[PDB]
Ligand binder design. Sequence first.
Ligand SMILES: [Fe+3]
Ligand SMILES: [Fe+3]
Lengths: 235, 235
Amino acid sequence: MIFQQLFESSSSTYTYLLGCPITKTAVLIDPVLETVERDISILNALGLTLRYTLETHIHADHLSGGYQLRQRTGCLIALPAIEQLPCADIGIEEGTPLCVGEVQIHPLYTPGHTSSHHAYYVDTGTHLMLFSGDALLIDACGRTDFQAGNAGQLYDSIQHKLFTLPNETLVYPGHDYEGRFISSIAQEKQRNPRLSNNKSKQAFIELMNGLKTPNPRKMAFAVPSNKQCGMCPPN
Amino acid sequence: MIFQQLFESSSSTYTYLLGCPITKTAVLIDPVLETVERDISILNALGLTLRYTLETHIHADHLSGGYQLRQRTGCLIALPAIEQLPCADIGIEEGTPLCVGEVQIHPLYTPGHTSSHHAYYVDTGTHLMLFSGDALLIDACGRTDFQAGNAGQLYDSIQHKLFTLPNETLVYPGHDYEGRFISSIAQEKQRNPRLSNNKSKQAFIELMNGLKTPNPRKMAFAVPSNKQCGMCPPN
Ligand SMILES: [Fe+3]
Ligand SMILES: [Fe+3]
């Protein structure tokens, strides 16, 4: 399977390109507006046709490239069904794969950063690849102080959906602010400072309430724009 | 491919189990004497026959489990041909793969931690997996203060053989002391404090000469025992 991990420096977002060599089709996971041209150039170099874009959640920190990408390529936009967004073409749910050629992408419902957040995993035959979005991050996790942030729920999602995955599962996060690209489930259970040493839910909730971070400066218009699949506002 | 990453806490070594699901045969990379029982129980639980043990180098910090494993399974011991060790069955060299069923293991000569150090890589179809031994480590690299320690040579080895692999290449290290399990070539180029920022060779050597770390406890008898494939001394 073709695989590329792409970084967007303004928002520190990872976009994941997955491609099927047999059918020459591809899906972009969490594409960013700022790097629409870069993603199209890479797809053209590899001779892949963009068949789906795929969001893990409704981002507050950047605008989704999905609207632009669908204009320029005619791909279908896929994102969580529970959001009931008219502009989306495909509604993702746990239990129903998204098939890009011979690649199967399995959603996992992981709320708590947002209420409709999904992670995705792919079996390569040797590794499970976990695109964990903002649910589990490398040595951290998604912030829970947004409106629909729910730390107790995020803890459940990580414990039940992600830490029940085998030790060698690769963790590909939605963001990183420190130059890290990859982890594994065993590594996060061993040393993630927010979840290691069988930290209890109560201790996790207190830890996550004790974080004080400036909100993403885009938050005002990114969330409504991303509810429109990345379509800019008139303002 | 069956893949497991196994930790041995006393020396902080990673042993890697690779298995062919079709022929039911396996290899262990850097098996440790203290965990021979564990490795054999795991092999049996997976219904695998151990065909080869494979060392990255002559270890100074632990005794290889290769000798005992061969006694107990009848496997063959493979290690770098340049060491010319009579107890070994197979001489490893760059350019000649080690074949375990349908799994192909490719050596890369990467001296500088020792003069015979080899890394190994495997292609899963989606990832290149780099077993880097003590050449490249996560956010560090192997110590260069042993007798055949050669910092300038290690730098060449990492730059020419490892940093030229593709970005998404997985880095499975020989050791880790901070609970990390995995990295990528892109991550290490990006943020490894010893090698990032196009750090110069002279700067890398100055840094390595400034590190002061204690010698591994077992070093006096581990190196001579591993030249006998992990057979203990009488005394
Ligand atoms: Fe987010
Ligand atoms: Fe070593």
